[PDB]
Design a protein around this ligand. Structure first.
Ligand SMILES: */C=C\C(=O)Nc1ccc2ncn(-c3cncc(Nc4ccccc4)n3)c2c1
Length: 270
């Protein structure tokens, strides 16, 4: 929880890039390569980094990536999770992993989302690509770039689409209930071991009979209105598929809470 002097941050590698980049650095004030490793995020967006840091300063959970401080143009310094993105990890260790492990990860993501809910924080971005793996036994939620704190008196706000709840698609509405819908897509992703051919984009594009890279918002809404949903992945226990279907109830108030999904996933693992 400190200001990291830029001169002491020794660049190791680029971890990711998007809309924005995350760099693996060694914080070496001594200058003898004994210092701890950190992940440094760097970028009209002064308002957005101000928004993101205010949220991250306030989160303290073993299931949410730890905010470590700042460095300087504002840079955000976070803990580094050595096993990287869940999407990469599941694809590389598929043969060595099992349904038990995916239930353990599902339970941990659900605990972090319960915590975010307790802070009236909407994550919005939740997807396997922003879940990070600390160790074989532990994952954490990352990417707070689109996160938002709800007002005290309003449980929603108005702002890829394959993780979004229908109200987000049709009315630009986001809430903790739309985060539950996205969590259902994450459960789907975990159970495919993040396989590219069965990704939410690949599967929804097949279901919609699309012959293009970019989906049509109107067609996805039509498919969802019909009651169509992502199928149960081959590796998927029937119990988990039922939980996904609940997260995907068309009305937000009819979706389960993370506090209700959580013990169920925990038990399936245990
Ligand atoms: C798959 C990319 C990757 O390996 N990324 C990554 C690995 C390890 C790690 N530790 C900490 N972070 C981190 C820290 N703060 C923010 C972010 N932001 C994002 C993570 C994942 C997707 C998008 C943004 N990551 C990483 C990141």
């Amino acid at each position: 929880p400190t200001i990291f002097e830029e001169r002491h941050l020794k660049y190791i590698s680029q971890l990711g890039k998007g809309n924005g980049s995350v760099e693996l650095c060694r914080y070496d004030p001594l200058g003898d390569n004994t210092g701890a490793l950190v992940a440094v995020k760097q970028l009209d967006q002064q308002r957005d980094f101000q928004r993101e840091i205010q949220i991250l300063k306030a989160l303290h959970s073993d299931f949410i990536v730890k905010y470590r401080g700042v460095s300087y143009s504002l840079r955000l310094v976070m803990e580094y999770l050595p096993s990287g993105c869940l999407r990469d990890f599941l694809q590389r260790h598929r043969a060595r992993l099992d349904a038990s492990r995916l239930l353990l990860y599902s339970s941990q993501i659900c605990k972090g989302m319960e915590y975010l809910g307790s802070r009236r924080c909407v994550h919005r971005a939740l997807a396997a690509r922003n879940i990070l793996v600390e160790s074989e036994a532990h994952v954490k939620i990352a990417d707070f770039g689109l996160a938002k704190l709800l007002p005290l008196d309003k449980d929603y706000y108005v702002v890829p689409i394959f993780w979004y709840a229908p109200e987000s698609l049709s009315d630009n509405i986001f809430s903790r209930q739309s985060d539950v819908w996205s969590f259902g897509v994450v459960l789907y992703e975990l159970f495919t071991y993040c396989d590219k051919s069965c990704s939410p984009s690949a599967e929804f594009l097949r279901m919609m009979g699309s012959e293009r890279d970019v989906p049509a918002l109107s067609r996805l809404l039509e498919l969802l209105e019909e009651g169509q949903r992502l199928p149960a992945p081959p590796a998927c226990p029937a119990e988990v598929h039922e939980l996904m279907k609940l997260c995907w109830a068309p009305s937000p108030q009819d979706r389960p809470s993370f506090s209700a999904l959580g013990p169920q996933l925990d038990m399936l693992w245990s």
